[PDB]
Amino acid sequence: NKNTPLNSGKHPDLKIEVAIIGAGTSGLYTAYRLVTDKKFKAHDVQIFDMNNKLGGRLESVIMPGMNFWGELGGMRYLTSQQIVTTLIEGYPLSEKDPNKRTPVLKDKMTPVPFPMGDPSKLLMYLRKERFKQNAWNEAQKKGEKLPTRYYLNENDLGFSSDQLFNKIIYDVLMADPWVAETYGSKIIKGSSVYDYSFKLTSRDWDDIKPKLVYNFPNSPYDQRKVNDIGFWNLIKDQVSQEGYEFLANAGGYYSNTINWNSAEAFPYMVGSAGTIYKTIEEGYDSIAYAVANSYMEHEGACIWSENKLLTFTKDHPLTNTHKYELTFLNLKTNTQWKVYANSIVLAMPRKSLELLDQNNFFFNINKNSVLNNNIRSVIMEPAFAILMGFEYPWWKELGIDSGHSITDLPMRQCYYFGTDPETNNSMLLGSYGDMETETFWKALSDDKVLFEVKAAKSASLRELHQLDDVQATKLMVGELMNQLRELHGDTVTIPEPYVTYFKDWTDEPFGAGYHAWKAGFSVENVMPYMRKPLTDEQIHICGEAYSDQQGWVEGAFCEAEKMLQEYFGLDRPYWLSPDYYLGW
Amino acid sequence: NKNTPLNSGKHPDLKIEVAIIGAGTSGLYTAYRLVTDKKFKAHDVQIFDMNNKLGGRLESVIMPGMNFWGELGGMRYLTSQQIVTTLIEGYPLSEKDPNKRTPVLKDKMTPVPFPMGDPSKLLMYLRKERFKQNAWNEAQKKGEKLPTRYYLNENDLGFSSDQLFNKIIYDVLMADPWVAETYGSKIIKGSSVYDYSFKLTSRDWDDIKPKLVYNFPNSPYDQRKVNDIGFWNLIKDQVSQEGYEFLANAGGYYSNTINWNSAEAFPYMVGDFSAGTIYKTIEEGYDSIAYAVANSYMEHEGACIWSENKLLTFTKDHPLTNTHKYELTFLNLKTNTQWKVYANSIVLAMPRKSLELLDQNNFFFNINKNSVLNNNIRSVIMEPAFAILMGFEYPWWKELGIDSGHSITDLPMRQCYYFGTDPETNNSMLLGSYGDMETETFWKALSDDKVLFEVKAAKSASLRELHQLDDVQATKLMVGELMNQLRELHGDTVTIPEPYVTYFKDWTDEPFGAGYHAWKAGFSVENVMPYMRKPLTDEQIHICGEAYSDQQGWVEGAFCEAEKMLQEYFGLDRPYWLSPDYYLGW
Ligand SMILES: Cc1cc2nc3c(=O)[nH]c(=O)nc-3n(C[C@H](O)[C@H](O)[C@H](O)COP(=O)(O)OP(=O)(O)OC[C@H]3O[C@@H](n4cnc5c(N)ncnc54)[C@H](O)[C@@H]3O)c2cc1C
Ligand SMILES: Cc1cc2nc3c(=O)[nH]c(=O)nc-3n(C[C@H](O)[C@H](O)[C@H](O)COP(=O)(O)OP(=O)(O)OC[C@H]3O[C@@H](n4cnc5c(N)ncnc54)[C@H](O)[C@@H]3O)c2cc1C
Ligand SMILES: N[C@@H](CCCC[NH3+])C(=O)O
């Protein structure tokens, strides 16, 4: 099922219609739709990737001793996300009997609820104070305002990150008279001082984001579109720099507090009625294999692996039959070869576009200044993944079965991932890094001395030594361990891990775990621009990077889907609800 | 003096010996040394720069209404920095009467002390608590430990940033039995629990840096070289993450607490010992020293700075291989035309970002061939810096008894310098400097906004005179928000009027990409610097400047790497005016 054939060879002067570069979710989706809907013969639609596997920022692994999937990248979806959810669970989404669902993909994918853990037992370690994540509510129940070691404005005393986030969004929304008048019924202040709520639809947000004005006559930002203010800028303005410190640390990875587009950050922070987080039992990269395999069933279909796009020109022998000559580097031989095509789908993030030849007709800055301006419209957020295997789930000593702990320590957030009921070998995702913490972790992960795998139950040295290459560094494992002991306190002994799995998503060609719209850009005009930057060229960009659901597979799918409907003459899939809002 | 001629023209197929690219301090210094010592005729040594001025990261400006120089880049030097000090002040450095000194450069430069201000009156604003910088020392004088809103380890309670830094570096140095035994006399615990001091020379540090071992039994970094540990990694290990938070915030810009090479951070933090040394500047603007070196170079006949001429690439494959090893292709920015220069030596007097912006596919940079060059180019952190000069109609900071110096905060602005009052006009200058600890991204969104602060007349400053600065004004959003932070910083007992003029430079802009550079942990710095001065054995191509110096942040770093390069590969002797006991390493 994950043995989808990959061709690391070359086919000099291959002639095709559509060259898809990026075997990520969006590249795979594009190929699947084109050939499934018979817009093109499989042999005329080809995917190229420089990697030695498909899926890009989806990579599921198994570590000896633990018979279940760890995620180095994407790990879960929301049933709000209708392209990825329908693909996994069949259609229609309304049918709630899973045996009256019609499958869309053949590949076996077993949906399973994402365990969220217990906030009575999940930790919050801020400025050396240890809390249960529930401590703000428990204090509110008892009429109290929880003291913390952040000096908030007095009006915000006792608030939780979530409630204070809600208050900031409510306050800013209601200060726009037009937003108050038109959507005030969807922007609700409850009875309790802490309770705010929203019923704003994706559609309502597309109306609000380009028009929202920041209405605060003493602020340096007064009478500016919220589109034009960084989220850090905006949060400090509303609740002081100590307010921003509290939210940026207490929010964890569920929160994006970088200084990105306030207008885009609003819906990102406050969310479709009755949705939940799920994953796939067979690994979250199963959705990529499933889309890939559906494409590769057609003979002529090919993923060219370990083949890196260098450049592309209109000035080549074959202009009578093919607009574009693409030059590929075949990595196994270090030889270049040519591919001829009439359409190019760059299914790749910002960093991957910047690593392509910047001097060709498409990227040359002396011609396409506007394209380069639009490529630079998104922040490249760093992420890494360190998976750690322990001989027993030491976290269960604190009544923690699953979920995440949050700290202002450089580790920021850990996920208690699961236990092998036969071995008791148990998995932590210790990581992701982010704001500032990239440089803290990068000095340690760049170090040359790798963690030494250690034998465990159902995990022999000769099984483990196959993972030598992908171990975290001793310095990074040592220091993460030191922080986990500090995070969890002295009432639990944490033993040394026996195996690790490390990936850094800042590495080329990814340059980022995820992307974030910059303040000052008309997101609603950039997105359609990137799906076809030049009027008289059949070159398209798709993927998560320039989507409005950054952070998610669903963003990559939606930009591919819109590109398909816009330029490749496809209708909405038969299996996708006509009410799922896509946009323009 | 600052009217040094620049040639924005071209001269196709110019045939020289040494092309120096970058008319910054190291490039100017290289050309000045080469001609003054008569190693080549001035027509055989040319300087090319893409800028419309010389000086690079030195740029001194005058704003209408204020008859004194503001600094967009470098401000100050230390009298222990012997090249930059001797070129400014003349020699010998022992002579304490300036009128008894012997000039080295003909251009006149008035050395003045850099006002450091009064720690009684300068502010520290941390987690919404307002301190005077001397509050820690005041508390200790009464036998007290000053509580703060940072939850230090108990053993560290009541330490100032300066004291806690010395304790950290003392503790780490002294835990190494070799360092203890060999340099314990120069690593000094005073009487008070807060008093740590260092007498380690430049030479002592060069012996210590590669050898020092982190000796803390249950540390994650135990038994590793301190050179292989990030400074944030080390600080946290030593005083907890709350301690790092205190030290990173309360440290000025003086302080470099990014996660760079710990071995290199130690000397940066506690000086190369000459305890009688002080900070000074040039009355005529700190860029004066670039102009003095550049003018000394230009008084030789055939000397030329090619301005607005950008190096694109260079090759060994050209028609003239019989006389000239290298063809350089420049872009003449005025005509948008490419012209060639032929040369046998290339001096890239430019930082990391500048190197990376050159053609990476040529024989020199090609990563498929020169993996070691590329690793080493990437051995320094590009640290962001912005400068915003703000001119007010009076020095509102005098209401708090502040004459000069720096106030420090955890607010995004991080630090402001009170730069001076024009005694005729009362027009008074403030610098906000910011960029470290993620404040880059806070400020970038505001400085990338396109509505600019509008100038406004004041005494001896007419809109006619101010409108020439329209293009260099800060954004309105940035000036508004910095003004809001200065009000929060100083408190509600002083009214801060809106300013009448600003001046913004972003040093992350190309081709600089950084204010200054920082060695990464885990590199053999003592081996990377010699490499960078001549990466390839078969090639007379050399890199000099501040970025790969061991005095990062400083003009003296640029001068020293050029000086070493001149002695190593251009057969120059030590300048007659430079003490032979000024340590330049190997
Ligand atoms: C740590 C982390 C956690 C995440 N968690 C989740 C989550 O829980 N849920 C979720 O839905 N999403 C999550 N995501 C995001 C999700 O993984 C991505 O949004 C999605 O996989 C991106 O797909 P894409 O189509 O944009 O392409 P990418 O995944 O970016 O793939 C692009 C491909 O292009 C290839 N390429 C680049 N340049 C070239 C070239 N010159 N020639 C050939 N090939 C080239 C690369 O090798 C790569 O395979 C997470 C991401 C990370 C990093
Ligand atoms: C905010 C700030 C504060 C500082 N404070 C001090 C201080 O107080 N005291 C002190 O001593 N030092 C200070 N410094 C450091 C000092 O300014 C620098 O270290 C010094 O100027 C570095 O000189 P350099 O030779 O490395 O070249 P740079 O000054 O980096 O100049 C390099 C030159 O190369 C040119 N160039 C690059 N690429 C090309 C190309 N392709 N073609 C043509 N030209 C090119 C650039 O235009 C530039 O003119 C400060 C720096 C900054 C940013
Ligand atoms: N979707 C990601 C989080 C997005 C991160 C954006 N900075 C996850 O669930 O892990």
Residue numbers in the entry:
A (entry chain B): 1 to 271, 274 to 586
B (entry chain A): 1 to 586
Task: List sentences from the manuscript.
AncLLysO has a fold typical of the flavin-dependent amine oxidase (FAO) superfamily —the Rossmann-core fold, which recognizes FAD, and a hot-dog-like fold, which is important for the recognition of substrates. Taken together, we assigned a novel FAD-dependent enzyme, called LLysO and bearing a main L-Lys α-oxidase and promiscuous monooxygenase activity, from the database.
Previous research indicates that, in many FAD-dependent oxidases, the Lys residue at the site would recognize the O2 molecule, which oxidizes the FADH2, and their variants quietly reduce the activity. In AncLLysO, K387 corresponds with the residue, and the activity of the AncLLysO(K387A) variant was reduced below the detection limit of the activity assay as expected. Crystal structures of the L-Lys- and L-Arg-binding forms of AncLLysO(K387A) were determined at 2.4- and 2.2-Å resolution, respectively, using the cocrystallization method. Next, we attempted to represent structural changes of AncLLysO that are induced by the binding of substrates. Structural comparison between AncLLysO(LF)- (green) and the L-Lys-binding form of AncLLysO(K387A; magenta) are shown in Figure 5D, suggesting that dynamic structural changes could be confirmed at the following residues: 251 to 254, 383, and 516. The active site residues E383 and Y516 moved to the optimal position to recognize the L-Lys associating with the conformational change of the plug loop in AncLLysO. Structural comparison between AncLLysO and other LAAOs may be helpful to predict how AncLLysO exhibits high substrate specificity toward L-Lys. Superimposed structures of AncLLysO(K387A), AncLAAO, and VioA are represented in Figure 5D, indicating that the size of the active site of AncLLysO is narrower than those of AncLAAO and VioA, as the site was formed mainly by bulky aromatic residues (Phe and Tyr). The narrowing of the active site in AncLLysO made binding to amino acids other than L-Lys difficult; therefore, this could be one of the reasons that AncLLysO exhibits high specificity toward L-Lys.
